[PDB]
């Protein structure tokens, strides 16, 4: 079994701050798997920050940024989409359990 907790959330922030998360992730040999469904994921989330209050947590895999699939996308490009968005970001993530 793979228990999936999917959420799609909107982050809104001032310029004096970040969204409050570390994004990590990778080649071309990645094949999406229930255990590991995406390339980029959240390494940590600032508990006192914006991405935490919206429900993002350590270990969330990033599925969609601002409406676009980023399952197979590389770190620099995903970071770019996120940076284009400015002070708002719509992201879809999944948490995998068991």
């Amino acid at each position: 079994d793979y228990i999936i907790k999917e959420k799609t959330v909107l982050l809104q922030k001032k310029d004096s701050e970040g969204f409050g998360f570390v994004l990590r992730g990778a080649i071309e040999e990645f094949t999406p798997t229930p255990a590991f469904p995406a390339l980029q994921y959240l390494e940590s989330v600032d508990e006192g920050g914006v991405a935490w209050r919206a429900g993002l947590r350590m270990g969330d895999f990033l599925i969609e940024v601002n409406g676009q699939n980023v399952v197979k996308v590389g770190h620099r490009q995903v970071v770019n989409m996120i940076r284009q968005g400015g002070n708002t970001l719509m992201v879809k993530v999944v948490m995998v359990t068991r």
Binding site: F19, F21, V22, L23, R24, E43, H75, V79, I82
Partner: peptide, 5 residues
């Protein structure tokens, strides 16, 4: 890679 956002 890693990036604080």
């Amino acid at each position: 890679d890693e990036t604080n956002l």
